[PDB]
Every structure is written in C-alpha cells, then in structure tokens.
C-alpha cells in the first residue's frame, strides 16, 4: 500500500498501520505519533445552511485548530500549532485532493509545510473518514509566533479577486502582483523562478482559486520579508462547473486588467492561455529567454512525478483521471511559443 | 463608537478608533519598532480612512469560519470591527486586537 | 539595521558570492542562462575575480540579491 | 557617521571615484605609477568600468581611501 | 625691496611701506592692516633667566597671544587667533629663520597657515626689532574652536622624543608614527605623499626638532580627523652645537628604535642617512617604487625654490649660507638609491 | 586629593579624579558624544592609570611659558592636575579644564 502522509510504498513492518515511520517523523517529529485522533467527526463540527451557492469551493471547508500533546492531538479554541480541514459534506473527497496536490508540490521542490491525512473515530463501525492536517507556518521552534501578512491588505486591495471597480472586471493581475513582491522581498533569481513556477503549476493542475489571500509575507528576520509557503493548493478540475468559470483566478498579464486588452493566446485559434502568454510573464519578471526555455523543458520531464503521485493518491479514481486530463491538455499548450 | 487597542508581538503598539465620520488607526508615541503592515508604515503615525483599513478588513475570516458567528449574533451585514473583536486572539501571525 | 561586510580582497568577494549561491540553491548552468557569462568564466569569478571584468562581477551580485555599497 | 552609497550601475562607481580623485587633487599620472594601470585605462575606469577588470577598480578604490562593502 | 610677509619683490608704491597689499590681505584679510605694532618688547616679553638647559632652541622661544581688533594687533590673556613668537635673546634672528623656512614650505605645496613678520615699537632711535606671527589653525571662519590633539598624547607616549626607557635611547620612529597615522586618518595616497614629503624636507632643511609634539590631529568634523598643517618649522643648521647633535629628531626606520639596529646608510661609506633610507620608509608607507622615483625627481627640480626663497629672505647672510650648505650636501645623498 | 571637570565644546563631558592610588578619568554614562582623544574612546567609560594619562600630560605648557608660570604659581612640584587647573581656560583646542 501507500503511506497516508508521504504516499510512499510501505514496508512489511509499517504496512498494517498504514503510516510509515518516516512520515510520522516528518509531521510530529516523533515516531510515537498516533494518527487515529479519536474525536469523531460529529464531535467537533457544526452544520448549517449554505451562505451563497457558488461561493468558491473552499468557502465551505471547515477548519479546526489542533495541538499535539504526548503523541495525541487535541482541539484548542484559540492559537494552535496544527490546522485540521475535513472534507465538506457537499464535496466529499476534498481532503484527499488537497493532500495529493500538496504532496505533489512538495516533491516538485516547492516550500510546502508538513502535511498528512488523519483518521476520524468510527461511530457505528463505518469506514473511517480521513481529514487533512497541516502545520501553521506562523510558528517557529517551540511554537513561538512569527508575524505574517496577506497580500490583499499589503497591496491595499479591497477584493481578493481584484474586482475593485464600478463595473465587474478584475483590475489586479499576476504580473502586477509579481512586481509588488519583487520590490519588498529580495530580488534573487531563486525567488523569481519559484514564483513563476507557482503560477504555471497552478494553471497546469487546474487551481483557479489562487487569489491574493492565498499569498503571504512572513517577517522572520524582522525587516526583510519573504514569500510564504504554498498553502490551500487544491485542484478544481474534478468539479466542471467550478472549473469552467475561469482559467486562473486572476488575469495573467497586466494588459488584461479591466477588460482593456486580451492575451496573445486568446486571439489565437486555441482561445486559451498558452505558452507564449506565460513566456511574456517571465520576461516581465526579468527572466531571460534561454532560462525560460530551460525552465519549460524541466516542467515537461516532470510529468512522470505528476502522474505517479496522483495515481498513488487516495482520491476517488474518477477524480484522478479528471486532474490528469486537465494536466495533459494544458501541458501541451506550453509548446505554442515556437521560439528557440 | 468603539475603542480597541492593537498589540503586536504581545506588547500594545497601536490604537484603533471608530468615530462618527470614519476609522483612525494611530501608533503610540514611543513606538519606533516594526510596522504591523507595509500598508501602515511606522514612520507616518496618522492613518485616517472613512473605510476600514484594508489590512484590518483582510484580517477577518470568511466563509464557514464567519458563518459560525453569522448564526450566533447574525454577523451578516454587521460591523467588521465586531467580527475582529471576537477573533482578536485568534488572529494569524503575531497580531492581537483587544479592547481598552 | 542591515549588516554589512567590508570587502578586503577580490578573493573575499568571489568566495562570499559562491556562499550566497550555494545557500540559495542556484546552479552554475542556471546562472549562465540568465547572466550570459560562461560557466568557465563563472568558476574563476568564485575564486579570484581579479582578472574578471567588473560588469560580470556586478551582474552576478545582483542576480544573487547582493547589493554593493561604497564608503570611506 | 556612515554615508554608505548604494552603487546602482558600474558607471555610478566610476563617476563617484573620479569625484574623489579630483577632491583629493590626485592626477592620472600619479595613479599610473602607483597602481600600474595605464593612463588611458584609468580614464576608461572613470567613465564606465564595466569592461575594466575588477582588480583594477578595487585597486584604485583603495588608493583613494574608499572602502567597498556588500550587503542585502 | 622684498615683502615681510610674502617675500615677493615690492612695487614702487609699496617699497617704502615694506609690506605688499596682497600679503597684508593674506594674513588679516584687509588692506588696512597695521603691521607696525604699538607696543615695545619690554611691555610684555619679560626676559627670564637662563634655564637649566639641556632643552631645544625652541624651549627658549617666548610666545605671545594676539588678537586682531580693527586693523591693529592686540595682546590678550587667553584664547586668541594669532601667536607672536619673538626671537630668543640668546638666539637672535630666529624669527627671520622661521619666516623664511615656513614661506618655503608654503611655496612647496604644503599646508602652512598664514604667517609673516611684524615690527616692535621702538623705545628710542634703535633698529626696529622684528617678530614672527602666525594664525592658529584651531579656529574656524568666525574664530570658532576646532578640536586638535598632539600626537604624543594620542600615541600614549610620555616623551616628545620617544625616550620612554631607562636609557636615553629613543623607542619611537618616523616609520611607526606613519603607521599610527595611517590607521586613524584616511588612507589615501595624497595623505601618504604629503607626509613622506614632510619628513624628507625636515632632513633636507636641517629641522632636527620634528618631535611628536610638532604633529597634530585636527577633527574638522566628518568624524575622521586629518593631519595638522606644518608648524614650528625652523632650520637648526646655522647653530652647529645644536645641529650636530642629531640628523633627525626621531629615528627614521623602526629597526633603529632602542639602538637595536642601524640604517643601511649608516653602514655605507657615507655613514649618514642616504637615499636608500628614505626609500625604505616610503616602501613601508605603501608607496610604489615608480612613484617614489618620480617623487625623488620632483624634489630635485625644486632646488630653485629653496635657494631663491632663502636668498630673498631677511636672514643674516652667514645664516643663509649655513642652511644652503646643509641642503645641497644632503640633497646629493638622495641619489644613492636602488631603483 | 583633587577632582576636576573636563569640558569639550563648551559642555561637561567627564571627570578626572586624583586619589592616593592613582588617576581615574570617566566619561559620563549619559554622554554619547565625541571623544576628547583617540586614546580615550567613548566606548570604554573607565580609564584607571597610576600616572596622569598622557593626553592630560600633553595639555600642559612647556619651555618659556612653563618657566614664566612656575616662578609665580610655584605650586607643589609635579602636582600635575593642579598645573592644568591654572591653564584650564587657555587650553588649545575645544577642551577646557574647570574646577569641580
């Protein structure tokens, strides 16, 4: 089988438990972690009517603050060190989707906090329900708080999606967001490449909800800030209506703000974001063409990881092939730049 | 209307006041430390806005997290400063807002 | 308050830049594609850039986020 | 106490060093005898030392009492 | 027919006065300056008895504090802007010696404060007595104090000549003094070249009294201090008893401290400080050989200034010939170099 | 036996003290201004020496000026600091030595 934390093949010793010793050491730091938290789901949830039909797919996701006491997790009302996000009732399997996607991003070299899948206590001997857990990056060693800030407040933007006008168009773009970050954080090629790869892989894996509130600035050393780790990375591909709304949460290029202009790929026969559009995003950030071409070729060889990680996941088999279909299609669209 | 204090890294650093016309967030007098946001530099000490400063508005929860309190005191079409008050300790980062 | 390190020798700067490169995880090939400076010229710059042109040194520094200041 | 000046361009350094040379009253011939850098190359360093080797720039800096620092 | 401040030829209008209009403006800043003081020597300069001796000729020099109200000079108890140094009783003519030597240093490109010669009021019908005057460098534009400190206290050395031992040997050198200065002041070649030129010309012009107290550090703001201007530069060559004591006040090279070693020029047939000795001092300060050779050739072409300045001076012809004899001899010894 | 005040640029900067054991010059704990000498850095605030610190020794007059003053003020030989008091106002530079 596969581990519920690392999605790695299990040995004969760890098979029965379902959790590998390596994974348990990654999450807690101890090999005596009990991933069966007890605490049945009905214990610590509250159900109630829908706010508005269509308020994102993550707007219905519950959140539970957790702390670790002697290898067993415990619920705290305020200021914990772990966060538990069960799967929404209307969208079952979302916890397994988040796990697989975030595990993929960790394998791809990104900064992803320690995460895993936990098991709820059974009530009437029903199949165990599994819930996603992740460690808060707002804590340092011994759980001491570190200050963070969301990008929407920092950029003085009223709406998470940039709809700050008298009409209904978006006036903030991924290009403009990159420019803001470049000014306040360190302008090194490592930050630029990582930010570029976040946007491309959000598109490749069908995340149309990377709003400004899914970006953060952590003030660790003090004055100089740094880009926050990857969080709330879920794939919207399994849900066609939510997926077909928008290609990406925000406009890619600054030219598309307010409906003023369109991306070069929109004018093409494909009528979609293509490779030439993402190439223009890289040149805006200062990335050289030869570097951008190699960065594209690296992503093509990384298809093996994407396929394997999702095929090893605990998602519904019907959800898996949906994500892989979006990936395969959009990945091929990265070749429509025809440059050397 | 409401008089609330802003504490960063535990010690109290600023003042949040809602008056008849609008909202004012002001730093203290001996505070030459770090700024709670890049949108609110510690250099400039006066921040008058007829709307809730975008930082404090973004600090509020949304969706299911907000839905718990919209069911309790109907925090729907309600003052965001009240929402922040209920979650002062539950604020992500090193920021806390507590009343005088 | 920003810490500052006074460069005493060309070797001092070259080695300190290699330390920044390795810390950030950047590769020699990656640096070549952006800067344009050949890999062979890059190896000499991270030992003693005494005979490497100032434009190449200044370029690599900015790619690594390192600022250069002067003061008596 | 500290008048640290961030060098933004290679040309910025060359021009800023030339100002110190004229301030202290030193001539190109005098610098040529000490540093060894030709008189023609010295004037090029005070225009744009982008194509002048880093050792020559650093040498002239030490001769003019200017220190070179790096930071982030 | 020459000026008493600038030692420049006088015009027909200014000949009788003895002072050129340009020179009076250099010192005071006005052309109305009265360089003929209105007080006799007996009024202020009390002639004290002979010291216990064993001191230098400058330990016998009196000093008078002066201030410039209107266009006439005036004596103050404390804190003036000018200092008047009359000629010692036992050493007459020293004021004219100081003037000529210091005028030469100004002409040679050094930083020398404004200086000149003034006349004491006569008592009966005697020959006018002349006294050297100099402006204090510890004063700003509005006579505002600028902080200065002498090197002996800064270097934490108790004796002016470096005799900080049980023997009369000297434990401080010109080489070590330069190293100290380099660390605390700015390390530019302009400072190094001028300091090197200061030491060579002290030897060339027979100033064997450049002790540590004849060096200063002026803190003209900007935090970092700078070397003080040239002051108390007199030639001791006219006085043989004082001259033959020592070539230079302090040992040139650090190897000579405490009598531990001797200079290469002392081992040579000349048995004196030669060109190689000052060359080794320059290499210690960081000066390149090609620069040192050109700096040596520059000093050689400057012989015209040295001869002319002293020949135009108001020194006794016997005193002039003494300084010029010391100069030419030592000047030729600078050519026993290696480069 | 005596204690004096060290003034720089018109402002009291330190205190020089004479006891049986030695001399102590201390900067003011609240004084973070310029140093009166490179031999007396403001970083270190304590300077104990069995002899008069060479800076204050160099501040004394010499030669004819000392001899003129010695026939008239003729105080205890090698009083050191006592000589400095009489020539406090006439001290070269921006330094003044004034009695406690």
Spell out the domain ranges in chain D. Answer: 10-63
Q: Which two tokens stand for residue B53?
A: 């400063």
- β-bridge mates for residue A149, sequence order: A217
Strand E82-85 to strand E226-227: parallel, antiparallel, or no bridges (unpaired)? unpaired
Q: Is E119 helix (H, G, I), strand (E, B) or coil?
A: strand
Check if E152 is active-site: no
Query: Any chain C CB within 8 A of the CB of D71?
Result: yes
Contact A208, A107 (CB under 8 A): no
- Residues in F touching E219 (Cβ below 8 Å): 34
Q: In whole angstroms, give the CA distance from residue A23 to residue E172.
A: 71
Contact F100, F88 (CB under 8 A): no
Contact E150, F58 (CB under 8 A): yes
Q: Determine the distance in angstroms separating the CA of D62 from the nearest CA of chain E, rounded to an integer.
A: 7
Q: Cβ–Cβ of C2/D54 closer than 8 Å?
A: no
Question: Any idea what the CATH number is for the domain that residue E267 is in?
Answer: 1.10.1070
Task: Look at residues D4, A285, D3 and name the one whose alpha carbon lies nearest to residue C67.
Answer: D4
- E16 burial (CB, 10 Å; 0-12 / 13-18 / 19+) is exposed
Full DSSP string of E205-235:
TT-----GGG-EEE--SSSS-EEPPP-S---
Task: Look at residues E186, E219, E200, E203 and name the one whose alpha carbon lies nearest to residue E282.
Answer: E200
User: How many helices (H) and strands (E) in chain D?
Assistant: 4, 2
- Residues in C touching A294 (Cβ below 8 Å): 29-30, 33
- B66 burial (CB, 10 Å; 0-12 / 13-18 / 19+) is middle
E224 in any annotated domain: yes
User: Helix, strand, coil proportions of chain E in percent (round to 5)?
Assistant: 40, 10, 50
- Name the residue among A58, A78, A213 with its Cβ closest to that of B89: A78
Q: Are residues A328 and A180 part of one domain?
A: yes
Q: Which two tokens stand for residue F93?
A: 């530079």
Chain C residue with the nearest C-alpha to that of A286 = C34
Structural domains of chain B, count: 1
Q: Is D53 helix (H, G, I), strand (E, B) or coil?
A: strand
Q: Classify each residue of F57-70 as buried b or exposed e, where b means 16 or more C-beta atoms within 10 Å of its C-beta.
A: bbbbbebbbebebe
Given A78, A108, A140, the domain boundary residue is A140
Q: How many CA atoms lie within 13 A of A297 on its CB side?
A: 8
What was the experiment behind these coordinates?
X-ray
Q: Which two tokens stand for residue A211?
A: 């709003």
Q: Which two tokens stand for residue A121?
A: 């206590």
Q: Cβ–Cβ of F55/E154 closer than 8 Å?
A: yes
Contact A164, A171 (CB under 8 A): yes
E142 in any annotated domain: no
- Residues in F touching E156 (Cβ below 8 Å): 39, 54
At residue A299, what are phi and psi to the nearest 5 degrees? -65, -30
Per-residue DSSP letter, D10: H
| Torsion, Cα of E125, E128, E129, E130 (10° steps) | 170
The residue to which tokens 């890059």 are assigned: C42
Q: In whole angstroms, give the CA distance from residue E310 to residue E332.
A: 19
Residues in chain E: 339
Run of H or E residues at E95: helix E94-107
Q: Are residues A98 and A57 part of one domain?
A: yes
Q: In whole angstroms, give the CA distance from residue F91 to residue B99.
A: 61
Q: Which two tokens stand for residue F41?
A: 């850095």
Q: In whole angstroms, give the CA distance from residue A333 to residue A326.
A: 11
Ramachandran class of E174: left when φ > 0, alpha when ψ lies in -120 to 50, beta otherwise: alpha
> Which residues, including other chains, have CB under 8 Å from residue A151's CB and lie 6 or more apart?
A157, A177, A180, A181, A212, A213, A215, A216, A217
- β-bridge mates for residue E66, sequence order: E75, E82
A1 in any annotated domain: no
Q: In whole angstroms, give the CA distance from residue E273 to residue E267.
A: 10
Q: Cβ–Cβ of C34/A287 closer than 8 Å?
A: yes
Q: Are residues E271 and E307 part of one domain?
A: yes
Q: How many CA atoms lie within 13 A of A27 on its CB side?
A: 29
Q: How far is CA A103 from CA A50, A197, A304, E186, E259, in A?
A: 30, 16, 14, 58, 79
Q: In whole angstroms, give the CA distance from residue E204 to residue E235.
A: 10
Residues in chain D: 72
Query: Domain D10-63 adopts which CATH fold?
Result: 434 Repressor (Amino-terminal Domain) (1.10.260)
At residue E2, what are phi and psi to the nearest 5 degrees? -125, 155
At residue B27, what are phi and psi to the nearest 5 degrees? -70, 170
Contact A292, A334 (CB under 8 A): no
Given E114, E135, E156, the domain boundary residue is E135
Q: Which two tokens stand for residue E333?
A: 């010894």
Ramachandran class of E81: left when φ > 0, alpha when ψ lies in -120 to 50, beta otherwise: alpha
Q: Looking at A108-238, which runs of residues are DSSP E strands?
A: 115-119, 130-135, 148-150, 216-218, 226-227
Query: Any chain C CB within 8 A of the CB of D51?
Result: yes
Q: Which is catalytic among the residues A69, A140, A167, A209?
A: A209
Q: In whole angstroms, give the CA distance from residue E89 to residue E68.
A: 26
Q: How far is CA B46 from CA A149, B7, B49, F23, in A?
A: 20, 17, 10, 53
Contact B34, B41 (CB under 8 A): no
- Name the residue among E48, E77, E147 with its Cβ closest to that of F64: E48
Contact F66, F78 (CB under 8 A): no
E5 in any annotated domain: no
Q: In whole angstroms, give the CA distance from residue D30 to residue E194.
A: 13
Q: Are residues A102 and A199 part of one domain?
A: no
Q: Cβ–Cβ of A294/C26 closer than 8 Å?
A: no
Q: In whole angstroms, give the CA distance from residue E156 to residue F47.
A: 13
Q: Are residues A79 and A220 part of one domain?
A: no
A11 in any annotated domain: no
Size of interface D-E (CB pairs under 8 A): 31
Contact E172, E257 (CB under 8 A): yes
Given A103, A118, A140, the domain boundary residue is A140
Q: In whole angstroms, give the CA distance from residue A205 to residue A323.
A: 7
Contact D46, D18 (CB under 8 A): yes
Q: In whole angstroms, give the CA distance from residue E119 to residue E97.
A: 15
Q: Classify each residue of E324-335 as buried b or exposed e, where b means 16 or more C-beta atoms within 10 Å of its C-beta.
A: bebbeebbebbe
Task: Look at residues E185, F3, B4 and name the one whose alpha carbon lies nearest to residue E195.
Answer: E185
Run of H or E residues at E82: strand E82-85
**Enclosing domain of residue E38:** 12-135
Q: In whole angstroms, give the CA distance from residue B40 to residue B12.
A: 16
A61 in any annotated domain: yes
Q: Cβ–Cβ of A154/B37 closer than 8 Å?
A: yes
E247 in any annotated domain: yes
Q: Are residues E131 and E201 part of one domain?
A: no
Q: Pinpoint the alpha helices (H) of chain A.
A: 21-27, 94-107, 151-154, 174-184, 189-204, 240-243, 264-267, 275-285, 289-301, 303-311, 317-332
**Enclosing domain of residue F18:** 2-99
Q: Do chains D and B touch (3 or more CB pairs under 8 A)?
A: no
Q: In whole angstroms, give the CA distance from residue B14 to residue B9.
A: 12
Contact A236, A242 (CB under 8 A): yes
Run of H or E residues at E182: helix E174-184
Angle between helices A189-204 and C28-35 (to 10 degrees): 90
- F51 burial (CB, 10 Å; 0-12 / 13-18 / 19+) is exposed
Q: Which two tokens stand for residue F69?
A: 């003053």
Q: Cβ–Cβ of C63/A290 closer than 8 Å?
A: no
> Which residues, including other chains, have CB under 8 Å from residue A208's CB and lie 6 or more apart?
A236, A242, A243, A245, A246, A247, A248, A249
Q: Are residues E258 and E129 part of one domain?
A: no
Angle between helices A189-204 and A317-332 (to 10 degrees): 120
Q: Which is catalytic among the residues E69, E159, E209, E232?
A: E209
At residue D53, what are phi and psi to the nearest 5 degrees? -65, 145
Full DSSP string of F22-86:
-EEEEE-TT--S--SBTTB-SS--EEEESS--HHHHHTS--HHHHHHHHHHH--STT-THHHHHH
Q: Classify each residue of E127-136 as buried b or exposed e, where b means 16 or more C-beta atoms within 10 Å of its C-beta.
A: eebbbbbbbb
Q: Cβ–Cβ of F94/E152 closer than 8 Å?
A: no
Task: Look at residues A117, A114, A123, A98 and name the one whose alpha carbon lies nearest to residue A39.
Answer: A123
Q: Are residues E212 and E115 part of one domain?
A: no
Contact E137, E231 (CB under 8 A): yes
Structural domains of chain A, count: 2
Q: Looking at D1-71, which runs of residues are DSSP E strands?
A: 5-6, 67-71
Contact A191, A139 (CB under 8 A): no
Q: Which two tokens stand for residue E177?
A: 């003094």
Q: In whole angstroms, give the CA distance from residue F14 to residue D29.
A: 49
Cα E34 to the center of its chain, rounded Å:
26
Q: How far is CA A72 from CA A31, A34, A87, A113, E204, in A?
A: 12, 6, 21, 20, 90
Q: Which two tokens stand for residue E77?
A: 């108890």
Task: Look at residues E224, E189, E286 and name the one whose alpha carbon lies nearest to residue D65.
Answer: E189
Size of interface E-F (CB pairs under 8 A): 77
Q: In whole angstroms, give the CA distance from residue B74 to residue B95.
A: 25
Q: Is A208 helix (H, G, I), strand (E, B) or coil?
A: coil
Task: Look at residues A103, A108, A120, A88 and name the one whose alpha carbon lies nearest to residue A27.
Answer: A103
The residue to which tokens 């010229």 are assigned: C41
- β-bridge mates for residue E132, sequence order: E85, E117
Q: Are residues A240 and A329 part of one domain?
A: yes
Q: Are residues A158 and A131 part of one domain?
A: no
- Centre a 10 Å sphere on the Cβ of residue B37 and count the other Cβ atoms it contains: 23
Q: Classify each residue of E79-111 as buried b or exposed e, where b means 16 or more C-beta atoms within 10 Å of its C-beta.
A: bbebbbbbbbeebebbbbbbbbbbbbbbbbebe
Q: In whole angstroms, give the CA distance from residue F86 to residue F73.
A: 9
Q: Are residues E84 and E130 part of one domain?
A: yes
Q: Is A8 helix (H, G, I), strand (E, B) or coil?
A: coil
- Name the residue among A56, A152, A225 with its Cβ closest to that of B58: A152
- Residues in F touching E147 (Cβ below 8 Å): 8-9, 34, 36, 93-95
Cα D38–Cα D42–Cα D44 angle in degrees, nearest 5: 120
Q: Cβ–Cβ of F39/E157 closer than 8 Å?
A: no
- Name the residue among E78, E145, E223 with its Cβ closest to that of F93: E145
Q: Are residues A152 and A136 part of one domain?
A: no
Q: In whole angstroms, give the CA distance from residue B57 to residue E145.
A: 59
Q: In whole angstroms, give the CA distance from residue C33 to residue B69.
A: 54
């Amino acid at each position: 089988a596969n581990c519920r934390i690392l999605l790695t093949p299990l040995n004969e010793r760890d098979e029965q438990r379902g959790y590998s010793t390596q994974g348990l050491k990654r999450l807690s730091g101890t090999a005596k972690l009990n991933p069966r938290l007890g605490f049945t789901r009905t214990q610590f949830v509250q159900e109630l009517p829908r706010q508005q039909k269509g308020m994102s797919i993550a707007g219905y996701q519950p959140k539970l603050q957790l702390v670790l006491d002697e290898g067993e997790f415990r619920v705290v009302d305020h200021q914990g060190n772990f966060i538990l996000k069960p799967s929404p009732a209307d969208f079952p399997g979302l916890a397994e989707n988040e796990h697989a996607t975030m595990t993929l991003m960790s394998r791809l070299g990104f900064d992803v906090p320690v995460h895993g899948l936990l098991s709820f206590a059974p009530q009437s001997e029903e199949e165990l329900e599994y819930a996603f857990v992740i460690r808060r990056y707002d804590r340092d060693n011994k759980g001491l708080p570190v200050h963070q800030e969301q990008l929407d407040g920092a950029m003085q933007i009223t709406d998470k999606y940039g709809k700050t006008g008298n009409d209904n168009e978006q006036y903030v773009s991924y290009e403009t967001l990159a420019r803001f970050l470049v000014a306040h954080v360190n302008d090194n090629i490592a930050f630029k490449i990582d930010l570029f790869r976040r946007i491309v892989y959000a598109w490749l894996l069908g995340n149309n909800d990377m709003h400004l509130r899914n970006f953060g600035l952590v003030y660790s050393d003090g004055l100089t800030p740094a880009l926050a780790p990857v969080y709330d990375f879920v794939s919207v591909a399994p849900y066609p209506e939510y997926f077909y709304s928008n290609y990406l949460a925000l406009p890619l290029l600054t030219r598309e703000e307010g409906g003023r202009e369109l991306a070069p790929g929109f004018h093409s026969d494909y009528g979609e974001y293509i490779g030439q559009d993402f190439l223009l995003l890289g040149e805006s950030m200062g990335l050289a063409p030869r570097l951008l071409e190699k960065l594209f070729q690296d992503i093509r060889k990384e298809n093996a990881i994407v396929m394997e990680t999702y095929e090893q996941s605990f998602m519904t088999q019907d959800h898996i092939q949906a994500v892989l279909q979006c990936y395969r299609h959009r990945l091929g669209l990265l070749h429509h730049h025809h440059h050397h | 209307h409401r008089r609330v204090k802003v504490l960063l890294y535990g010690q109290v650093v600023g003042e949040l006041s809602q008056n008849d016309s609008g909202f004012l967030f002001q730093y203290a007098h001996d505070y030459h430390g770090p700024a709670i946001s890049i949108s609110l530099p510690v250099a400039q000490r006066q921040f008058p806005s007829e709307t809730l400063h975008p930082y404090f508005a973004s600090l509020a929860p949304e969706g299911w997290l907000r839905q718990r309190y919209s069911q309790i005191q109907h925090r729907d079409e309600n003052d965001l400063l009240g929402m922040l008050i209920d979650n002062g300790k539950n604020l992500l980062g090193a920021i806390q807002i507590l009343p005088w | 308050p920003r810490p500052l390190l006074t460069i005493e020798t060309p070797r001092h700067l070259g080695e300190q830049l290699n330390a920044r490169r390795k810390e950030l995880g950047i590769d020699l090939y990656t640096l070549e594609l952006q800067t344009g400076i050949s890999t062979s010229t890059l190896k000499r710059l991270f030992k003693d850039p005494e005979q490497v042109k100032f434009g190449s040194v200044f370029a690599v520094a900015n790619v690594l986020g390192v600022k250069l200041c002067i003061g008596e």
